[PDB]
Design a binder for this molecule. Structure first.
Ligand SMILES: CC(C)c1ccc2c(c1)sc1nncn12
Lengths: 198, 194
């Protein structure tokens, strides 16, 4: 079920594809980024073609579309990280067991930002030895969500008398969400890597 | 593509099906257990029919069959747990975030005797103990150590091409640890007593 606009990979399981400015695909990501980080400049945007991460993510999405019936389960969010993590995330995606304690913690999980400006902080997108900062644009299965709490290792139950029927994610604020936390593998697909500088 | 031996679910996605004592599937699973736990009394064996856990596991199985270029990635192991964790496992499988001497993942035993210790299959009020029979994608494995968050790389030259699991002993393993969701399918739950 590999998407048809992807480059042919030739029995290869993984590829980074450099986007060209002037293409809609580049321009949409640049605009989404510059909306809140117009003081930074983009070096490049690579499309992540990871067949295994894509398949496992698309199965979880189909399962959430079935379970939630007629919700928008998928959001496009940002994740800033250090240069040393980029190879791991490219191949293996987002791993809660590697995740940093956020400065405002709404659970022990992987954090995603609504605004590029949050991910562009040096604490998340740590500038490398050449001043390159790195930020992923991520399809994230936010599903049905609630306000989190620092102690969560999984999302909380919707109903305390049914402890195993869970929210899909948590947020900082249900009325104006600016971040989301997810507690399961293959709930996030890293779609694009933005490399940028001051 | 839900397996032959599963029974009809009336368009449901989860159910626990109690096995008929003395029939083939029950005898197969009983024998695996009694090989090392013949002093314990089996009260029941339930088949876990979780369509979503099964789909996610099968996808990861096919990926590891392609990755490793052979089809010997799967082992049938035991997991003992407390009664308060059984409903989560039936619905969501194994979660590393819930000793951890060989790394921070989920532990599976080769022998039911290991999982039958009270420290894993904790007796509830009436002395009932709980053990899963689990399909585990052990794949290519290496010796683990404390504080692993994923398995090590096969070559430190290529740090993202990892082992699939770790063990206590590569030559004669008695336990495996997996660090990813959907590398284990809980296939049968054994309710038993000392
Ligand atoms: C001593 C330690 C490595 C260990 C920890 C947990 C565990 C086992 C062994 S065997 C088993 N079956 N279910 C759980 N566990």
């Amino acid at each position: 079920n590999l998407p048809e606009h992807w480059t042919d990979m030739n029995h290869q399981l993984f590829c980074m594809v450099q986007l060209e400015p002037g293409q809609s695909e580049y321009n949409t990501i640049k605009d989404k980024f510059t909306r809140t980080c117009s003081s930074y400049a983009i070096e490049k945007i690579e499309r992540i073609q990871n067949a295994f991460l894509w398949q496992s993510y698309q199965v979880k999405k189909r399962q959430m579309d079935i379970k939630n019936d007629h919700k928008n389960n998928e959001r496009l969010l940002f994740h800033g990280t250090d240069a040393d993590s980029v190879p791991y995330v490219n191949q293996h995606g987002f791993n809660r067991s590697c995740a940093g304690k956020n400065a405002v913690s709404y659970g022990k999980g992987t954090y995603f930002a609504v605004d590029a400006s949050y991910s562009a902080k040096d604490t998340y997108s740590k500038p490398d030895s050449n001043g390159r900062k790195h930020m992923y644009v991520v399809r994230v299965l936010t599903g049905v969500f609630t306000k989190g709490r620092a102690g969560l290792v999984t999302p909380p139950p919707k109903n305390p008398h049914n402890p195993t029927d869970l929210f899909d994610s948590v947020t900082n604020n249900t009325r104006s969400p600016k971040l989301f936390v997810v507690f399961f593998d293959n709930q996030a697909y890293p779609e694009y890597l933005i490399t940028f500088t001051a």
